[PDB]
Amino acid sequence: TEISFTNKNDTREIVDEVVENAFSSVCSTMGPNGNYVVINQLNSPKVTKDGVSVARALDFNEARRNMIAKIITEPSIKTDAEVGDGTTTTVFITYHLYQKFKDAMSFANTRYLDTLIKQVLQYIGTLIQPGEIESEMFRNMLLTSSNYEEEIVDKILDIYREHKNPNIHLEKSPMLPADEVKMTKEIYFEGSFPIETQVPANGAYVVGPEKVGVVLIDGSIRAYPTQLINALLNRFIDNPVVLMARNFEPEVIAAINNENQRLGTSRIFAYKVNAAGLLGAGTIDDLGRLLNIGPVFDVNSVDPALVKYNDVTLWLGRKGILLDKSIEEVESRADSILEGLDNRYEALGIIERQTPIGRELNRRIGRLRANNVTIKVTGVTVSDASERWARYEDVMKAARTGQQFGVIPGIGYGYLMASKWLEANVPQQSDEKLEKCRIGLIEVLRAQYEHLTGHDGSAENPIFIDLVTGQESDTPMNVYDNAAATMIALEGAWQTAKTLGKISNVMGRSNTNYA
Amino acid sequence: TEISFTNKNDTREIVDEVVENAFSSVCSTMGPNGNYVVINQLNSPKVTKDGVSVARALDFNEARRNMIAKIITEPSIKTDAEVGDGTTTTVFITYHLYQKFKDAMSFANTRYLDTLIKQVLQYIGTLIQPGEIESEMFRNMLLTSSNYEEEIVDKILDIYREHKNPNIHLEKSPMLPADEVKMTKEIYFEGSFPIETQVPANGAYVVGPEKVGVVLIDGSIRAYPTQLINALLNRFIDNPVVLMARNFEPEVIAAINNENQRLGTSRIFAYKVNAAGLLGAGTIDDLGRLLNIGPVFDVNSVDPALVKYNDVTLWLGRKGILLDKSIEEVESRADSILEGLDNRYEALGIIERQTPIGRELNRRIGRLRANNVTIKVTGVTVSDASERWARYEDVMKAARTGQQFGVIPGIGYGYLMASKWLEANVPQQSDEKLEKCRIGLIEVLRAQYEHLTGHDGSAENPIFIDLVTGQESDTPMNVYDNAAATMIALEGAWQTAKTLGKISNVMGRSNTNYA
Amino acid sequence: TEISFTNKNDTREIVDEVVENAFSSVCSTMGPNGNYVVINQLNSPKVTKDGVSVARALDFNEARRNMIAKIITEPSIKTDAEVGDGTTTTVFITYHLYQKFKDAMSFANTRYLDTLIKQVLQYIGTLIQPGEIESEMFRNMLLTSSNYEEEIVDKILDIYREHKNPNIHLEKSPMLPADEVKMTKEIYFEGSFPIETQVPANGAYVVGPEKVGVVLIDGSIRAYPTQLINALLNRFIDNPVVLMARNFEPEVIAAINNENQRLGTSRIFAYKVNAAGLLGAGTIDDLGRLLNIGPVFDVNSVDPALVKYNDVTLWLGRKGILLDKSIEEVESRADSILEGLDNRYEALGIIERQTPIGRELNRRIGRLRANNVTIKVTGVTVSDASERWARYEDVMKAARTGQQFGVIPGIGYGYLMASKWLEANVPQQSDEKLEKCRIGLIEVLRAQYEHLTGHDGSAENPIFIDLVTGQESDTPMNVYDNAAATMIALEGAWQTAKTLGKISNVMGRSNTNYA
Asked: What protein family does this chain belong to (chains A, B, C) (predicted)?
């Protein structure tokens, strides 16, 4: 009476049974007719539209089926961690791609389930209209709110109606007043203590003096920098010689004793710059001599720790420069704006498709060009402070989509036009009948539109393709237009449902060990 | 144990066996022929009638049915927490609104139905009798007791004759002579002890107000002040240092009972205030600048007891303060009521309609005015004393609601002026077949009068003028007039039973987890 | 608890349902149509491929099937505990050799079968193409990642270019540029504390190596060495006295913490070296007589620390000793590897065949040589860093089995040169009908080639030259070449699955006791 094998047709019909009451439990809440869910709690029951929480609480008892449902609810919440909404599109279209019950073999019907999905996503990336402005965010807030609290809508429209994409903070407020939207002058990215004797202060990590000798190195200085016998002697008794690096902190972190315990009364520093990117030669350039903090150091182990050229006290600039838990500069003169314009034209370049890989100086552009927005909410009670906090943090991610990525026209419109592309791009009977079957089944991208707008009428999947859906058209019996869900959900959540339409059928057992 | 997935028809028939037998619970207990309900205790039974103590106790054993009956009954006890009655009308007419169950496809006739019900409530707020004077209130007291005792009848009218809107209280005493009218100035608001060392008393907790130096935190104390000892030491025997705090005390109290109970041991108070409202900042202000608490402190926790703003100690006015389980006053003389309650009396211009914005607000702000009459019941036996005890308890609630919420012609006269108003209808005659069927079933607005007389009979729709509105009032089959219900019941019951007929058929499933 | 003498057909049907479902467990994870297995934990699931971690977790509920399937899976984890790959061929061709199951009367046709399979093993070991240069090892690395990154193909082969069999070690970092080639001389072996009082340090346990006087009672000592105090007193501050033994220490730690931690309290070490091997006496010898540990001492307790053989303290050569959780050294300069390891290097003339007795031996004895390469893998995020982490871990193992154990052309090419060698057979046409049926079913170890590529096709013994060796390689119907399984899979797995298809069919009952 315990856990076991299941093999095999006792686990066809135990994963044809959890991609049934997860499909018909989150294709409930799709649409305008949003059929609710009563999620049990420890407390009184929760009542939801929200597909995130339907995904979280898909909790059976028989540990075979809970063990299975943990690998279907995983991309449904991964899309939530990315954008926040699109959960009920992942866990929808992972069932309408689970008509690969039988066709799990490699060659024909995953080469035309890899290349075919590549060509469809190429065409969808062509289809993306730039959803950026606040009359388009006006169209966004029509649906991205899930009609709960329009005060948070007013907040986020005040956010991206005001200055362009600053550091949008994360801060609760379970006290009653003060929806707070404030701006500072603050640039903030990573550099902290290896040892507490390396930062100028240790209470609040403020710099001691202004205009200090602060030398900058970007990459790995692999000279094992205990060599500080003349490079440190340039400012031997003078000032905290603040040296920056990458996360290259080898065993020389114990060899900091060559100044800490040994000779050298200065206050040497050696810790990191930003995380893994191609962005090393600019991530020191925006810091240094372009805005007068330090040298624009070429990404190298050059200028070893023996001797520098010379470090002087006056090596900073007349602005707010303090190494903190993550370093602070205030009153940036021009090069923040210069790299902001650079990555602004770069974010004019690719954003039609918006491949993030190759772009993401724009992670710090916004932390660097614009300063900051510190925020607080109006939590009337700690519980719904947490609730509208959760939705508050959700909708600013949709604001991130509407600023960094764009907003495609409508929900099924990106599939009733990306199924035109299965007649435009190669619709032939290719070299396998499985391949012709598989273009006939990627013609069932139409089902999202179909099941969505045919809840209330009508589910006319061949008729609405060519001319009725266009543009912004998931045609109701209201206006036929002016409805658009976002971009990264409709595309990235589609791809991470291809991975579970490819896995949760190619599964065939369920075993037990404990590591 | 197996709390699981129900799917889905086993959530049609987990809610059609909650709403239907919840309906045959408290559809009989209305009207004249009130068939009782035997609530168990964990001891011997308690036999009762009204849907208050039945809807407390609609307790199936199962964790699915308890989950479903936690949403049909949360309006049933929030309704009489709001006023005192309207529960059984709520959870009756939720079943007669849950023949919308069959029309689960609803979004076409939910924009229609919910705006229609707004117009119906507008017509109910056209059918008003603002009964505030004792003209027909004499008939109400005459009818609620069959003129049981002219003391019990006319004594509360004599209280309303001179003193406005009192807090009425009653006691027992085995004695014959006249009842103890006690117009004594005390106003109820909240405050008690964190630790017994905080209060100057321990029997009745009564503070001893002299040179009372109060520092005010009106807001949610969220800045976590452990530094509340410096002005305490600066003000050790110079004043009884009173910090006012919110009911949200954080766990800094674990860092206060070891700090301020110790050295630095002045007469320190730091505990709760009432709930989050305008008199949350008002009960600390009317006794504040006027009668020695202090000026307006914002809803915040800023500037702790390092040092006070002002050392306001000797503002001891024509007042009395006594800390208690809930701190109250004795004989205040300042313009505590003239500050804000006149604004609430002109906000009682809404009492024509008496919109829900206000039904909490002006009862909370306005009914904390003045003298509160506390009497003792008499009676030459114990049994008749208990009878007039319970009957005076009955009559004071209807008197409070008549002062507070109006007195409408009830039984179905509200609903069957409404259904006549929807015969010569809201002038959009429904062309939509969904909306035509739905206006045919909002002609089952009649069912409350229909079932209320159909305990004996009979209400049919051409039998309006005969039995419903013959004779032109609330018509029991003796005298055909002289009955009245409270107006807020057949307003708010109709509202929240629409928001329980909108749920419970747009409900589809039932999961489990503990968050 | 009712496991006792099953009889007997209820122990033919306890292995007919163990080899069958352990066969459909891991004959699904083979080939191109890689049909995963969800291994549970007692936690959340893991979804895997490799028969390593399916054969770990084949765990029936019953105590009979678990008992039986601990002998079909125990050589399946031995086979890859020797190397890393070869599980599925073990626990696959043991099922295909379970057609002998009906010749349980065997001693006529199992004398013959090990004269046949010995000749097959000879013929498989005949046709090996051991890649050691990077001509077709370029094809191996080019094919094992679909040429993912040519830096990954070039970099692992460039580490193998100069240094003989280095320890490939790889890390993650948030830095992108050129990776960390570290040919660093350290020699790993095991050694830790029996009690914390034995180690001179406590943070990193590092010894303080000077005048290092080590005595060796090196073997599996049962003699309970509590007698270790007299030469300890003779060598109290004269040296850091170290005892070194095998893994077999007795429980004399009670006679250590109370005697040698106590009076007679020199810097005493007494703990293990690695498992049962000649370099268990060898890394203590070449770092001994050459680099200050001591001479060889075989398993005895003669000369304990009553009095030593030799007092060898100041023989500190060009090295660094460091005790740790496992004691190592850094940067030897004496020709300690030339003392004994060069003998096994000239005994690596076997590596043409590289017999299994030898695949344990000469790899266990000789691969403690020199540099261990410690690099880091990069990525433009952390996600792709983990991706090419996993793929880099996939490339180092295939290059390891290229360099270490030789390479044979894989998929079905090995066993269908074997079936060629058994059609032009051991030229006895078996006049014994038992042995004629036996070669008639050992020519049906064409079945691996069939149940791998007959998913697509095609396997018939007259259709050797057409599709099996057309085109002349590993021939699936994509490219007809460019694949290579490791040698040790299709030779050592073939061996131990013959000796599990000689067990499990000469099985006749299934008892129980407790010892």
From this structure: Belongs to the chaperonin (HSP60) family.
